[PDB]
């Protein structure tokens, strides 16, 4: 729990990047605009145990980040007057919870709308070169059309979108976080 808390410190430091991105319009000096955010990690076996190592392991190429963090928790309505509103929506937690819902959802057979076998192939694809990752995403989304909702480029042909010059994806966050949105408040 010593190590876990040290990571939660670095995650909240990451969550606080909303302070730079989401700001009060025409403020001088620039001031952060009240925006809640979450950063999290699930400490799988080979995932690293310190923040910089965790995130480095999620950068399979220096152009690519397999994370889209932090996740904004403030409602889209309360942010609309902020600078970085469009940023906040790309980083909205609701976007992660939707993708987790799609992963958890079922077809009319009562089988999952995306199988684990295909989810695992997409995990593997994300570590490839972006053209190999996007090629794999094309093949699997032809076969399992629910993956269109996981597209991020808007061209509906990549799990990645360009963000500050890096290709970033929410998909690996959704695969990992799949079982961690339990609630019980329905």
């Amino acid at each position: 729990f010593s190590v876990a808390y040290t990571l939660a410190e670095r995650l909240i430091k990451s969550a606080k990047e909303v302070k730079q991105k989401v700001t009060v319009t025409n403020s001088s000096p620039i001031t952060p605009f009240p925006c809640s955010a979450i950063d999290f990690h699930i400490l799988y076996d080979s995932s690293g145990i310190d923040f910089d190592r965790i995130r480095e392991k999620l950068r399979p190429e220096d152009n690519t980040e397999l994370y889209n963090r932090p996740y904004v928790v403030t409602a889209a309505e309360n942010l609309s007057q902020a600078q970085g509103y469009e940023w906040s929506q790309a980083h909205s937690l609701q976007t992660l919870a939707d993708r987790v819902s799609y992963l958890r959802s079922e077809d009319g057979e009562g089988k999952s709308a995306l199988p684990s076998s295909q989810s695992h192939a997409l995990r593997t694809a994300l570590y490839l070169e972006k053209n190999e990752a996007d090629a794999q995403y094309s093949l699997i989304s032809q076969r399992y059309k629910i993956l269109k909702n996981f597209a991020e480029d808007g061209e509906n042909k990549s799990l990645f979108h360009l963000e500050n010059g890096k290709y970033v994806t929410r998909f690996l966050d959704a695969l990992d976080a799949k079982d961690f949105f339990a609630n019980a408040n329905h």
Partner: protein
């Protein structure tokens, strides 16, 4: 120290597929379990659960006796299994491969293929072999009774493996059973374990020295013959013949087959029809899944696992193969035959085993032309000409039906008085099967599918005394070989349920 073992038992033999088998893997039902070499195999997890599952039904769910063999992660005294079940590669015999079973649900109102209810399943062919790969660590100087009972059940063919157990598949039988003992408590036995391949036990001694106990079941063996040609359709047209019999690989040969899926579904249809008549209930409005949900049929035949009303059928039907068999290339010669009076006649003469008698060949497999006639002109509506290879003289092995009486008891909560309405329905369905009211396979309104039933052998093991009159061989189609006091007994429980057609299963 390690776990203290008194005797290690290496328990080995050959498990043979007595029906086809399907064990599924992650990657509709066309993915069979494959090891890392990509060879088809039985996972030890799937074989263990078959064996553990059987013992659980044997021991009336006495959890303690089960967990003493199979282990328990919860109880502080238990932990790991004392049975090790290894993975076993399946040796599909030469000139054989995985087959694909294609099938369809039949709409109960229209009597036709229900839209959206086609299915495909890949199956390891019958006669395929894999090792019985068991090790038992004994902590006392014997061999457990329930484990001896399990090995007897395996030699009896009583244990089912894989998917589609009620609907054609999963039957296995054990042969060549060997037991090797290693007294790991002692130096001679440890060095024997290291060097000497163990003290042989004659299984025939122990197998004689205790009575085999099955869980309750009723075997039904139906001796039948095609009254009119009986075939399932092969999904592909031939070249000379459009409609061909379905064959399946059976050892190194091919045989004609009626899948137990087909016999199950016709029997389910008759069960459901009898209940809906007694209730005067209409399934015209309901969809296919709704049309199937009916009382007493949901237990004898099962309900789909939809989130749960899902149930496995207490009644299981084997794939029925023809007594005739062919070499695989002999049947390919028929499938490849391009001309009905050309190269088909050699090919059919070879396959039926009458190479020099076209008459005797065609008394077994008869090619038949069918033509639709235009009503206005009286002309053959050409393009509506089609041909069938009718298995008019194919002899068939007896239909094997297995009623899991223990499964019914669990559904009815042990009280065998509830069994009587289900048994009554099953006998009413067998009365219809014996009276030619249940045609089987393709083309039943088109000159095929009626069967004679010569004999129904009812073979109950460990039946309750009130169902003991079921242990009978019947030859009257109307079941008058069953004791009239027993048939009146069943008839009364049946009539009581009819009065309140409630769901027994509470």
């Amino acid at each position: 120290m390690a776990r203290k073992v008194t005797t290690r038992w290496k328990i080995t033999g050959t498990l043979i597929a007595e029906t086809p088998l399907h064990i599924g893997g992650v990657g509709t039902d066309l993915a069979l379990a494959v090891n890392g070499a990509g060879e088809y195999y039985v996972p030890g997890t799937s074989l263990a659960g078959a064996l553990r599952g059987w013992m659980t039904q044997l021991l009336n769910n006495d959890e303690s006796q089960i967990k003493d063999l199979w282990g328990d992660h919860l109880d502080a005294k238990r932990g790991a299994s004392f049975v090790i079940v290894d993975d076993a590669v399946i040796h599909i015999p030469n000139n054989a491969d995985v087959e694909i079973r294609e099938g369809v649900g039949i709409d109960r109102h229209f009597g036709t293929a229900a839209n959206g209810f086609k299915y495909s399943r890949a199956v390891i062919p019958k006669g395929s072999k894999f090792k019985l790969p068991l090790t038992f660590d004994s902590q006392d100087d014997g061999l457990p009774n329930a484990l001896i009972q399990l090995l007897c059940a395996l030699e009896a063919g009583d244990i089912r493996l894989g998917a589609a157990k009620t609907r054609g598949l999963g039957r296995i039988k054990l042969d060549d059973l060997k037991l090797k003992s290693f007294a790991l408590d002692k130096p001679e036995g440890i060095f024997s374990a290291l060097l000497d391949q163990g003290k042989k036990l004659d299984w025939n001694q122990l197998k004689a020295n205790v009575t085999y106990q099955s869980p309750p079941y009723l075997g039904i063996s139906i001796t039948w013959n095609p009254k009119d040609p009986v075939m399932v359709k092969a999904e592909g047209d031939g070249l000379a013949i459009d409609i061909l019999p379905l064959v399946s690989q059976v050892g190194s040969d091919v045989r004609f087959v009626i899948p137990g899926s087909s016999i199950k579904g016709i029997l389910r249809t008759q069960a459901e029809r009898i209940i809906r008549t007694i209730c005067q209930s209409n399934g015209s409005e309901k969809n296919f899944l709704e049309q199937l949900r009916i009382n007493l049929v949901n237990e004898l035949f099962g309900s789909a696992s939809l989130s749960d009303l899902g149930k496995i059928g207490a009644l299981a039907v084997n794939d029925c193969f023809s007594s005739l068999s062919m070499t695989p290339d002999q049947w390919k010669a028929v499938e490849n035959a391009t001309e009905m009076t050309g190269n088909l006649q050699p090919a059919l003469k070879q396959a039926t085993g009458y190479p020099n008698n076209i008459s005797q060949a065609y008394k077994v497999l008869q090619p038949a032309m069918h033509v639709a006639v235009d009503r206005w002109t009286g002309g053959a509506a050409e393009g509506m000409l089609y041909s069938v290879l009718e298995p008019i003289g194919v002899t068939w092995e007896p239909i094997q039906v297995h009623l899991d009486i223990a499964r019914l008891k669990n559904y009815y909560h042990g009280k065998e008085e509830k069994l009587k309405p289900a048994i009554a329905l099953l006998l009413l369905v067998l009365r219809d099967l014996a009276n030619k009211k249940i045609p089987v396979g393709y083309g039943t309104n088109r000159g095929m599918g009626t069967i004679t039933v010569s004999q129904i052998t009812l073979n109950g093991k460990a039946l309750p005394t009130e169902l003991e009159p079921l242990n009978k061989t019947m030859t009257c189609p109307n079941l008058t070989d069953l004791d009239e006091a027993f048939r009146q007994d069943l008839s009364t429980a049946w009539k009581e349920w009819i009065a309140d057609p409630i769901d027994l299963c509470q």
